[PDB]
UniProtKB/TrEMBL annotation:
The protein's name: Saposin B-type domain-containing protein
Tree of life domain: Eukaryota
Domain Saposin B-type: 2-81
Gene: spp-5
This protein's UniProt keywords: Disulfide bond, Signal
GO process annotations (BP): defense response to Gram-negative bacterium; defense response to Gram-positive bacterium
Disulfide bridge positions per record: 6-80, 9-74, 35-49
GO molecular function: channel activity
């Protein structure tokens, strides 16, 4: 992929690692939050967004769940690419 794909990963995590309740539910939501507005004028952006909060969130959050950084996930998770 190599594109905004990573960004998104930095949207879920950024929301996860920096949430407040540590809710992977309200975390993946936050993502689609801006992922929508931030990328409201993106082709399939908002589409993939929701397709990310529930597809690359369970895993992404999985890493940070074990003790991984938000800069380590988007790499070993072969998600960034």
């Amino acid at each position: 992929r190599s594109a905004l794909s990573c960004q998104m990963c930095e949207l879920v995590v950024k929301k996860y690692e920096g949430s407040a309740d540590k809710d992977a539910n309200v975390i993946k939501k936050d993502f689609d939050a801006e992922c929508k507005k931030l990328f409201h004028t993106i082709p399939f952006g908002t589409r993939e967004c929701d397709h990310y909060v529930n597809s690359k969130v369970d895993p992404i959050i999985h890493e940070l769940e074990g003790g991984t950084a938000p800069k380590d996930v988007c790499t070993k998770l072969n998600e960034c690419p």
